[PDB]
Amino acid sequence: DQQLVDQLSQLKLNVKMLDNRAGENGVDCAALGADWASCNRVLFTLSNDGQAIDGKDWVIYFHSPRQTLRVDNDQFKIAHLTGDLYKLEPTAKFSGFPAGKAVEIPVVAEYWQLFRNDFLPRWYATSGDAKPKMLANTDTENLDQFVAPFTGDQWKRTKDDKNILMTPASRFVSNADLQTLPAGALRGKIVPTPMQVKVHAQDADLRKGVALDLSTLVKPAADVVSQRFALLGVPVQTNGYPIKTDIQPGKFKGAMAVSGAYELKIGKKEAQVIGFDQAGVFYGLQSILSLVPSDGSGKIATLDASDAPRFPYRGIFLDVARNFHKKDAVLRLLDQMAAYKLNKFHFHLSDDEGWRIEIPGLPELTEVGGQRCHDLSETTCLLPQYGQGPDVYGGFFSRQDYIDIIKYAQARQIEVIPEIDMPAHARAAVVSMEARYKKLHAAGKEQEANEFRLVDPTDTSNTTSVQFFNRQSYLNPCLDSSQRFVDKVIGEIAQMHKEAGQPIKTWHFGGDEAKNIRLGAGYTDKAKPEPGKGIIDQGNEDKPWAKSQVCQTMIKEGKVADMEHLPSYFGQEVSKLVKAHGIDRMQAWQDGLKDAESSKAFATSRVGVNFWDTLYWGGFDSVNDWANKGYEVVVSNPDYVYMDFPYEVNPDERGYYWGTRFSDERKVFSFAPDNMPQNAETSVDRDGNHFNAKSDKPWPGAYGLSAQLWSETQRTDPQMEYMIFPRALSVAERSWHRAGWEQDYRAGREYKGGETHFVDTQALEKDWLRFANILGQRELAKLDKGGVAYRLPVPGARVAGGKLEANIALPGLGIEYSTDGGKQWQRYDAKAKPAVSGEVQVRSVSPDGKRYSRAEKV
Secondary structure, eight states, X not given: OHHHHHHHHTOEEEEEEEETTGXXXXXXXTTTTOGGGOEEEEEEEEEOOSSOBOOOOOEEEEEOXXXXXXXXXXXXXXXXXXXXXXXXXXXXXXXXXXXXXXXXXXXXXXXOXXXXXGSOOOOEEEOSSSXXXXXXXXXXXXXXXXXXXXXXXXXXXXXXOOOOOOOHHHHHHHTTTOOOOOGGGGTTOOSSOOSEEEEEEEEEEOTXXXXXXXXXXXXXXXXXXXXXXXXXXXXXXXXXXXEEEEEOGGXXXXXXXXXXXXXXXXXXXXXXXXXXXXXXXXXXXXXHHHHSOSSSOOEEEEEEEEEOOSOSEEEEEEEOSSSOOOHHHHHHHHHHHHHTTOOEEEEEEEOSSOBOBOXXXXXXXXXXXXXXXXXXXXXXXBOOOTTSOSSOEEOOBOHHHHHHHHHHHHHTTOEEEEEEEESSSOHHHHHHHHHHHHHHHHTTOHHHHHHTOOOOTTOOOOOOOTTSOOGGGSOOTTOHHHXXXXXXXXXXXXXXXXXXXXXXXXXXXXXXXXXXXXXXXXXXETTSOOTTSEEEOGGGOOOTTTTOHHHHHHHHTTSOSSGGGHHHHHHHHHHHHHHHTTOXXXXXXXXXXXXXXXXXXXXXXXXXEEEOOOIIIIIHHHHHHHHHTTOEEEEOOHHHHBTTSOSSSOTTSOSOOSSOSOOOHHHHHHOOTTSGGGGGTTOOOTTSXXXXXXXXXXXXXXXXXXXXXXXXXXXXXXXXXXXXXXXXXXXXXXXXXXXXXXXXXXXXXXXXTTTOOOXXXXXXXXXXXXXXXXXIIIIHHHHHHTTOOOOOOOOEEEEETTEEEEEOSSBXXXXXXESSSSSSOEEOOGGGOOBOOSOOEEEEEOTTSSOBOOOEEO
């Protein structure tokens, strides 16, 4: 009843990592069914400051990205519901939560939990009658409230992990090649770097404003520029410094004769931008704006530049499905994209845990699919996921919100690419269409009920998705109703884009992870168990749709060879629907199209792939095959450009980390997307090891670059901003500009980390030093003005010769220190270092002085 839930809600949870490598220390993880026999031991402690809790009619619900494999307190048991949702219940041996005591519940979980961020907030209790209530101390984004600090070598994945733990003292070393450059060295430095620039000695004075000639641009685009001058403190006035614009396509030739190319001339008395097109004029103006200083001086260098993008596709991907992000956050992101010349916004509007776009005629998609809540029937909500609590959590973009976003991107020269992921990652759609089926069926409207149904009622397939959903995560690609649904959704979204004035150019089908993870290599069968693998019953495991009667008859009429080819077949079918709606380009995650012959198998004349294999695993050679089969390769490697991964190897950092342990601003900048093998000399794998890379295959080149923000642990808008910025500025650089240390691809050349010395790393280092200085001394102050809650790096520090020496990853940023336990903070001056004794803590501060990094002790 309610009393029982009220009692449980007052239990205080404490989570403590016990052993991240339990398999190395005597636990038989294989016998517990752990993938690759890898498992960890965690302690859950529930403390009771009230009277004894003796009822047994209760369930405690919690979230975890890891499966629980064993519970080592026999008074309790843990069962999986679906996705990340688990339940803790009393067994027959349960004898209560004693008054004033703590109960300890040790568990064994699959894999490892290397970051405190792995542990999710908002545990909640239920009981018969009662409304669910959270365990109050867990109702927070501050993990310090319920998760103990990691100690010792608990951050290590294996005993052989070679990653380096980042503390002030080891960070000082990683940053020691950096120094603060004199302002003079940053004169005339546009970001992203222009193809060609000649800086002159005179400066142009913008203090009394600029007189803009934006006649070449449509009003909304011209308004963007005017607003941005004003934001950075340069008033627009007729009597100001004249900036003239023109469009002259005929002045550009060959590979410079592309959208976004421009010629820029900044003189002492006036400036002139000549674009190939409107994007080109807009970009030349963003280049001038990039030069506006953050010291209030309003002076910029005179110069002559000629520029054009290295790639036509310079993207940012955003997941709003896992956790929603508000329209205002999306707009702020589009502003920054335009400022650094990123032009493709890949909008992941749906997944298992949410559906975020209103679709005329299919209200259940947003009414049910748009919200999560504790509704076991999933008639009004999808089940809770990701530690957002038991109560309604969600949101979606109305049709007008969506049109607003498209207009906003269009003014900024950004193309909106909608993604409706299928045939896997489709639980929100499948469950919503099941609520629709039920509703209409109840009213006796059977044909309407079945019209858009995404389930074959005969299907009894036993399949487990990557996030531990079952067959409802997979829309059935064999149903005519499924094709009706796709067609309807394409139609409705294409209409919004037409209304917004930016007709869809690319439809993104998704296509990722359409498989049963239990048939993967790290699992083995109970009957003939291979050593080192998770022992499960694999005989009851099906490939997706294997038990669907409709898919079986499709295989018999000769349409598809086998069940495994369904995702690719479905992609071919969707391309026809895409083409039928007047869209001539389709894009997908490459694994979804792996069984298609070539780009020739699709109805659109253009087919792009987001290439998301990791390099150290072989991605440096497998990418060639996509380009050579006719696909436009959009480089999206998780080991460099996944922005849901941590900035540094520190257990208090945010992010997932399956593809790599960290990717900071520097690592992202150092990525060479058009000569993938060369990254073997400039980076390390996920365990900090050097790797080797070679390809003998032809490489025609990449079509683009994309950086992804997946939203599993980015529960809030500020968290999303922390994760994207400032490292998206490194993405903008690399997607626009090909550096001198980025070598031409050479078939048969083998780069061996730690061994070969093909790459010019001194050139790389010098380029990064300048770029880091431009961020710390100029651009982060502009992010402050755009209201973006970017990550502030923690300083590096050491104590030497009795004084504090501190440094930072982005030189120019302010540093503070405290010698009293972090109560009084003082500014660090490098030319008058402070004499220090005892415990010292350091933190950085934003240019506007309002925000601080996390504080760490040296």
